[PDB]
Design an enzyme around this catalytic site. Sequence first.
Site, mmCIF file in Angstrom:
data_model
loop_
_atom_site.group_PDB
_atom_site.id
_atom_site.type_symbol
_atom_site.label_atom_id
_atom_site.label_comp_id
_atom_site.label_asym_id
_atom_site.label_seq_id
_atom_site.Cartn_x
_atom_site.Cartn_y
_atom_site.Cartn_z
ATOM 1 N N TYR A 45 0.815 -1.185 0.000
ATOM 2 C CA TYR A 45 0.000 0.000 0.000
ATOM 3 C C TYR A 45 0.861 1.252 0.000
ATOM 4 O O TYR A 45 2.044 1.230 0.362
ATOM 5 C CB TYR A 45 -0.940 -0.001 1.215
ATOM 6 C CG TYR A 45 -0.205 0.269 2.502
ATOM 7 C CD1 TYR A 45 -0.076 1.563 2.987
ATOM 8 C CD2 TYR A 45 0.396 -0.770 3.215
ATOM 9 C CE1 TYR A 45 0.624 1.821 4.151
ATOM 10 C CE2 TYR A 45 1.089 -0.527 4.383
ATOM 11 C CZ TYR A 45 1.201 0.770 4.848
ATOM 12 O OH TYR A 45 1.900 1.025 6.002
ATOM 13 N N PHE A 55 3.142 10.726 4.267
ATOM 14 C CA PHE A 55 3.183 9.621 3.321
ATOM 15 C C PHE A 55 3.853 8.375 3.917
ATOM 16 O O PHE A 55 4.891 8.457 4.585
ATOM 17 C CB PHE A 55 3.906 10.043 2.039
ATOM 18 C CG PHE A 55 3.740 9.076 0.897
ATOM 19 C CD1 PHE A 55 4.664 8.064 0.687
ATOM 20 C CD2 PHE A 55 2.657 9.180 0.033
ATOM 21 C CE1 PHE A 55 4.515 7.173 -0.367
ATOM 22 C CE2 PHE A 55 2.499 8.292 -1.015
ATOM 23 C CZ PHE A 55 3.430 7.289 -1.217
ATOM 24 N N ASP A 56 3.238 7.224 3.662
ATOM 25 C CA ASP A 56 3.741 5.942 4.115
ATOM 26 C C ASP A 56 3.560 4.922 2.993
ATOM 27 O O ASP A 56 2.547 4.939 2.294
ATOM 28 C CB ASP A 56 2.963 5.501 5.358
ATOM 29 C CG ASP A 56 3.489 4.217 5.960
ATOM 30 O OD1 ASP A 56 4.715 3.986 5.910
ATOM 31 O OD2 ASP A 56 2.668 3.436 6.489
ATOM 32 N N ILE A 75 -7.325 -0.120 11.062
ATOM 33 C CA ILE A 75 -8.442 0.817 10.996
ATOM 34 C C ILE A 75 -9.669 0.190 10.324
ATOM 35 O O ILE A 75 -9.563 -0.707 9.481
ATOM 36 C CB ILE A 75 -8.078 2.142 10.279
ATOM 37 C CG1 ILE A 75 -7.447 1.888 8.903
ATOM 38 C CG2 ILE A 75 -7.154 2.991 11.143
ATOM 39 C CD1 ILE A 75 -7.372 3.138 8.054
ATOM 40 N N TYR A 101 -8.912 7.187 12.573
ATOM 41 C CA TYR A 101 -8.434 7.516 13.923
ATOM 42 C C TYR A 101 -9.362 8.464 14.705
ATOM 43 O O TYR A 101 -9.029 8.890 15.810
ATOM 44 C CB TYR A 101 -7.023 8.102 13.847
ATOM 45 C CG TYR A 101 -5.951 7.108 13.448
ATOM 46 C CD1 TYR A 101 -5.275 6.362 14.407
ATOM 47 C CD2 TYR A 101 -5.600 6.928 12.116
ATOM 48 C CE1 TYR A 101 -4.283 5.458 14.050
ATOM 49 C CE2 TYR A 101 -4.610 6.026 11.749
ATOM 50 C CZ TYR A 101 -3.953 5.298 12.719
ATOM 51 O OH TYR A 101 -2.972 4.408 12.363
ATOM 52 N N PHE A 118 -5.660 5.868 0.729
ATOM 53 C CA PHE A 118 -4.808 4.696 0.503
ATOM 54 C C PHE A 118 -4.939 4.195 -0.931
ATOM 55 O O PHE A 118 -6.025 4.200 -1.505
ATOM 56 C CB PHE A 118 -5.203 3.531 1.426
ATOM 57 C CG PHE A 118 -4.926 3.774 2.873
ATOM 58 C CD1 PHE A 118 -3.694 3.443 3.420
ATOM 59 C CD2 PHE A 118 -5.901 4.322 3.701
ATOM 60 C CE1 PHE A 118 -3.431 3.664 4.767
ATOM 61 C CE2 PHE A 118 -5.643 4.552 5.045
ATOM 62 C CZ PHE A 118 -4.407 4.221 5.579
HETATM 63 C C1 LIG Z 1 -9.545 0.367 14.634
HETATM 64 O O1 LIG Z 1 -8.434 -0.415 15.104
HETATM 65 C C2 LIG Z 1 -7.117 -0.064 14.921
HETATM 66 C C3 LIG Z 1 -6.168 -1.079 14.862
HETATM 67 C C4 LIG Z 1 -4.828 -0.783 14.701
HETATM 68 C C5 LIG Z 1 -4.397 0.534 14.576
HETATM 69 C C6 LIG Z 1 -2.995 0.749 14.440
HETATM 70 C C7 LIG Z 1 -2.551 1.204 13.073
HETATM 71 C C8 LIG Z 1 -2.488 0.055 12.076
HETATM 72 O O2 LIG Z 1 -2.377 0.635 10.758
HETATM 73 C C9 LIG Z 1 -3.540 1.002 10.131
HETATM 74 O O3 LIG Z 1 -4.663 0.834 10.619
HETATM 75 C C10 LIG Z 1 -3.373 1.603 8.851
HETATM 76 C C11 LIG Z 1 -3.692 0.620 7.729
HETATM 77 C C12 LIG Z 1 -2.565 -0.384 7.581
HETATM 78 C C13 LIG Z 1 -1.289 0.294 7.129
HETATM 79 C C14 LIG Z 1 -0.893 1.220 8.218
HETATM 80 N N1 LIG Z 1 -1.985 2.153 8.702
HETATM 81 C C15 LIG Z 1 -1.797 3.455 9.095
HETATM 82 O O4 LIG Z 1 -2.727 4.152 9.523
HETATM 83 C C16 LIG Z 1 -0.370 4.081 8.996
HETATM 84 C C17 LIG Z 1 -0.339 5.387 8.135
HETATM 85 C C18 LIG Z 1 -1.101 6.602 8.772
HETATM 86 C C19 LIG Z 1 -0.691 7.775 7.877
HETATM 87 C C20 LIG Z 1 -1.398 7.586 6.550
HETATM 88 C C21 LIG Z 1 -0.836 6.363 5.843
HETATM 89 C C22 LIG Z 1 -0.910 5.119 6.735
HETATM 90 C C23 LIG Z 1 0.190 4.345 10.416
HETATM 91 C C24 LIG Z 1 0.473 3.034 11.143
HETATM 92 O O5 LIG Z 1 1.425 5.065 10.334
HETATM 93 C C25 LIG Z 1 -1.370 -0.795 12.164
HETATM 94 C C26 LIG Z 1 -0.055 -0.346 12.068
HETATM 95 C C27 LIG Z 1 1.015 -1.242 12.122
HETATM 96 C C28 LIG Z 1 0.776 -2.612 12.247
HETATM 97 C C29 LIG Z 1 -0.542 -3.060 12.308
HETATM 98 O O6 LIG Z 1 -0.899 -4.362 12.453
HETATM 99 C C30 LIG Z 1 -0.086 -5.347 11.872
HETATM 100 C C31 LIG Z 1 -0.996 -6.560 11.732
HETATM 101 N N2 LIG Z 1 -0.881 -7.518 12.870
HETATM 102 C C32 LIG Z 1 -1.084 -6.912 14.201
HETATM 103 C C33 LIG Z 1 -0.850 -7.931 15.316
HETATM 104 O O7 LIG Z 1 0.440 -8.574 15.120
HETATM 105 C C34 LIG Z 1 0.419 -9.357 13.950
HETATM 106 C C35 LIG Z 1 0.357 -8.323 12.817
HETATM 107 C C36 LIG Z 1 -1.588 -2.158 12.260
HETATM 108 C C37 LIG Z 1 -5.349 1.572 14.657
HETATM 109 C C38 LIG Z 1 -6.711 1.275 14.832
HETATM 110 O O8 LIG Z 1 -7.705 2.209 14.895
HETATM 111 C C39 LIG Z 1 -7.400 3.470 15.513
#
Ligand SMILES: COc1ccc(CC[C@@H](OC(=O)[C@@H]2CCCCN2C(=O)[C@@H](C2CCCCC2)[C@@H](C)O)c2cccc(OCCN3CCOCC3)c2)cc1OC
Length: 128
Positions: A45, A55-56, A75, A101, A118
């Site tokens: 992504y 940007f990521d 998310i 968020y 995204f």
């Molecule tokens: C509603 O529930 C949520 C659950 C988790 C999160 C934590 C962030 C989560 O990342 C994201 O949800 C999104 C979509 C996936 C790519 C990364 N995401 C971002 O927002 C990232 C960026 C935010 C700036 C815009 C571009 C994307 C952020 C981590 O810097 C994230 C980041 C890094 C890893 C991750 O999970 C990895 C998957 N598994 C997790 C358990 O261990 C096995 C792997 C998940 C927030 C939530 O809501 C506030």
Amino acid sequence: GAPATVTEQGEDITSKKDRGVLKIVKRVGNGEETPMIGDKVYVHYKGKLSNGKKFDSSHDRNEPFVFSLGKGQVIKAWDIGVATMKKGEICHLLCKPEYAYGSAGSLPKIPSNATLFFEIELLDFKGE
Ligand SMILES: COc1ccc(CC[C@@H](OC(=O)[C@@H]2CCCCN2C(=O)[C@@H](C2CCCCC2)[C@@H](C)O)c2cccc(OCCN3CCOCC3)c2)cc1OC
């Protein structure tokens, strides 16, 4: 802009139909099947705030992003959005703060009430 195009042409894929997650298919995927809840999904992504900031990309760390679908590991937009994708599909998602968020944001990176954009490519999905 890539965001506004989703605003204009995107399909509302939310259950409540509040335009909180909008989707455009940019590349059609393979076959017909789409992932189940608990499927281990692999994606690349690119994402950012709607305004172009923070940007990521998974590419610049040379690894597919992996997660379990429909478990709240990401998310809300991602669980809703990726479940609609076919393997090899590429889509664009515009995600209102309610499906990202919210009001809290995630400081210092994500401010309050941020809309996220995204591009997601679904590489693969396999069962729980
Ligand atoms: C509603 O529930 C949520 C659950 C988790 C999160 C934590 C962030 C989560 O990342 C994201 O949800 C999104 C979509 C996936 C790519 C990364 N995401 C971002 O927002 C990232 C960026 C935010 C700036 C815009 C571009 C994307 C952020 C981590 O810097 C994230 C980041 C890094 C890893 C991750 O999970 C990895 C998957 N598994 C997790 C358990 O261990 C096995 C792997 C998940 C927030 C939530 O809501 C506030």
